[PDB]
Amino acid sequence: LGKGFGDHIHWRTLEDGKKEAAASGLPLMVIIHKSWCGACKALKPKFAESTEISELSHNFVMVNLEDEEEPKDEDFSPDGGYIPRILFLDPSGKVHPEIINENGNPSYKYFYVSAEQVVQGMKEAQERLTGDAF
Ligand SMILES: [Cl-]
Ligand SMILES: [Cl-]
Ligand SMILES: [Cl-]
Ligand SMILES: [Pt+2]
Ligand SMILES: [Pt+2]
């Protein structure tokens, strides 16, 4: 179910994941990716091999959406249709586009290229989205 992002991580569908998030009070982390894309291919082993990403993932409903699993919902492309994109959602299921890859390029807010960048996004989302801190 991880599609290369790591089989030691619990992966949910978006629909099941939103149900779990609401019931557990967990934010969601949604990774949109395509099976042909070079950026997606490159990110996968970096994500899968990160102990810190795995430890942080317990605080989220983790969702990866491959190819046609991508939502037909503009909330999931706030600044463009590049891939992969990582978006964080509150437990009620709303996308929080203000949580971005701060160490990336400002034109590609949801484009993360290293495990270290992903970890920083997860840490911010955990703090901001859990318990409606925002
Ligand atoms: Cl491509
Ligand atoms: Cl690419
Ligand atoms: Cl390409
Ligand atoms: Pt590509
Ligand atoms: Pt597709």
Swiss-Prot record:
It is an enzyme of class 1 (oxidoreductase). Transmembrane segments: none annotated. The chain holds residues 30 to 163 of 172 of the full protein. Protein-disulfide reductase of the endoplasmic reticulum that promotes disulfide bond formation in client proteins through its thiol-disulfide oxidase activity. Disulfide bonds join C37-C40. It comes from Homo sapiens. It catalyses: [protein]-disulfide + 2 glutathione = [protein]-dithiol + glutathione disulfide. GO terms for biological process: negative regulation of endoplasmic reticulum stress-induced intrinsic apoptotic signaling pathway. Residues 1-127 form the Thioredoxin domain. It is found in: Endoplasmic reticulum lumen. The keyword Secreted does not apply. This is Thioredoxin domain-containing protein 12. Optimum pH is 6.5. Its EC number is 1.8.4.2. GO terms for molecular function: protein-disulfide reductase (glutathione) activity; protein-disulfide reductase activity. Keywords: Disulfide bond, Endoplasmic reticulum, Oxidoreductase, Redox-active center, Signal. Widely expressed. GO terms for cellular component: endoplasmic reticulum; endoplasmic reticulum lumen.
